[PDB]
Amino acid sequence: GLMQFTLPVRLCKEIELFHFDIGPFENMWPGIFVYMVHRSCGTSCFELEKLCRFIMSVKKNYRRVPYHNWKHAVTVAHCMYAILQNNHTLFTDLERKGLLIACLCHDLDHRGFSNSYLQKFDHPLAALYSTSTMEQHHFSQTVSILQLEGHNIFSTLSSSEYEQVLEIIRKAIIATDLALYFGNRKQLEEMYQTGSLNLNNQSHRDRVIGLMMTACDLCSVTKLWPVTKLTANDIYAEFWAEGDEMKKLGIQPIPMMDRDKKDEVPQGQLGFYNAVAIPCYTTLTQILPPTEPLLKACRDNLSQWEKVIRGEE
Numbered sequence: 001g002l003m004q005f006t007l008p009v010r011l012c013k014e015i016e017l018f019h020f021d022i023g024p025f026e027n028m029w030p031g032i033f034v035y036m037v038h039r040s041c042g043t044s045c046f047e048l049e050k051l052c053r054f055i056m057s058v059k060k061n062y063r064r065v066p067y068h069n070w071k072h073a074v075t076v077a078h079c080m081y082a083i084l085q086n087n088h089t090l091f092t093d094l095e096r097k098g099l100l101i102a103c104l105c106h107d108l109d110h111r112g113f114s115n116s117y118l119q120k121f122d123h124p125l126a127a128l129y130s131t132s133t134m135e136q137h138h139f140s141q142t143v144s145i146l147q148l149e150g151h152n153i154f155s156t157l158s159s160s161e162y163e164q165v166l167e168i169i170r171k172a173i174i175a176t177d178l179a180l181y182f183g184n185r186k187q188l189e190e191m192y193q194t195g196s197l198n199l200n201n202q203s204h205r206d207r208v209i210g211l212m213m214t215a216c217d218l219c220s221v222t223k224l225w226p227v228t229k230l231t232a233n234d235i236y237a238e239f240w241a242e243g244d245e246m247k248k249l250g251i252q253p254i255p256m257m258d259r260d261k262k263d264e265v266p267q268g269q270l271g272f273y274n275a276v277a278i279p280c281y282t283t284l285t286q287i288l289p290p291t292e293p294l295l296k297a298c299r300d301n302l303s304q305w306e307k308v309i310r311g312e313e
């Protein structure tokens with residue numbers, strides 16, 4: 001009960017900033033996550049013993065893929081931490097509990113392949129879940145792990161509180177399906193601009209939590225340029241493996257996934273920042289003004305990709 005996690009001074013200060021990088025020491029990521037649950041939620045939110053056992057089971061069910069890995073899970077949870085800490089009073093006790101857990105779990109048992117590749121391969125998961133195929137699987141893996149003995153971190157919640165938190169985690173994880181992001185942000189755009197946006201409306205909260213999930217999920221584009229650039233290498237390492245697998249099924253992959261079209265990555269990054277990232281963090285900043293450093297950092301990284309195209313790097 002009187003047992004705080006404390007980080008070295010550089011980490012203690014920099015973990016509070018949106019652009020923090022969790023570093024290359026895998027063995028510190030669990031302690032980093034617990035530190036964030038404790039400051040974000042409280043030292044009473046979870047039984048330390050159960051939490052530690054849940055974290056280590058989650059780690060074990062992430063795979064050794066270049067991008068959709070345990071580092072990604074903790075990085076996405078850290079961006080959520082920064083959002084929650086900069087918007088103290090906007091979120092319920094259950095939302096604060098549920099969202100860091102959702103983020104840690106949001107890519108559980110990812111194989112480094114997109115929903116499309118599962119559908120073209122005719123993977124069993126694509127018959128069990130016709131849309132948001134991997135995201136429904138990630139939620140399913142979350143429920144599995146919560147049900148392992150000694151793993152129920154929510155054990156002290158009431159029956160209805162428990163159902164509300166699993167329902168926050170489900171929607172939060174489903175929303176990380178980027179196919180859903182576009183419509184979600186358009187609706188939020190209109191509600192904000194016509195002044196209809198209402199955070200006491202549960203369906204409105206749901207959309208706002210969804211946009212936060214997209215924002216945390218994409219947070220590599222809000223880091224310092226060397227983090228952003230090296231993370232994009234991991235992203236394409238997965239995409240190009242998927243492209244190779246498409247070619248094995250006899251299908252020309254989209255260029256994004258075709259390693260033969262490496263040269264076009266910089267232009268593809270501009271498309272991505274303009275079509276996805278910038279609009280995401282813009283709408284987020286409109287709804288939650290203290291998230292502005294994500295928009296500012298994203299703009300800086302867009303300008304770095306523009307310099308890449310101009311041959312200035």
Ligand SMILES: Cn1ncc(C(=O)N2CCC2)c1C(=O)NCCc1nc(-c2ccccc2)nn1-c1ccccn1
Nearest residue numbers: 218220221232235255256261264265268269271272275
């Ligand atoms: C940086 N970041 N963070 C998450 C993700 C991500 O998409 N996902 C899904 C798993 C994570 C990314 C990311 O880089 N995506 C690739 C962006 C992208 N690359 C290309 C492209 C085209 C041709 C040749 C080479 C590259 N086009 N394109 C694009 C263009 C317009 C609209 C959408 N995408």
Ligand SMILES: [Mg+2]
Nearest residue numbers: 106107134176
């Ligand atoms: Mg995902």
Ligand SMILES: [Zn+2]
Nearest residue numbers: 106107176217
């Ligand atoms: Zn993700």
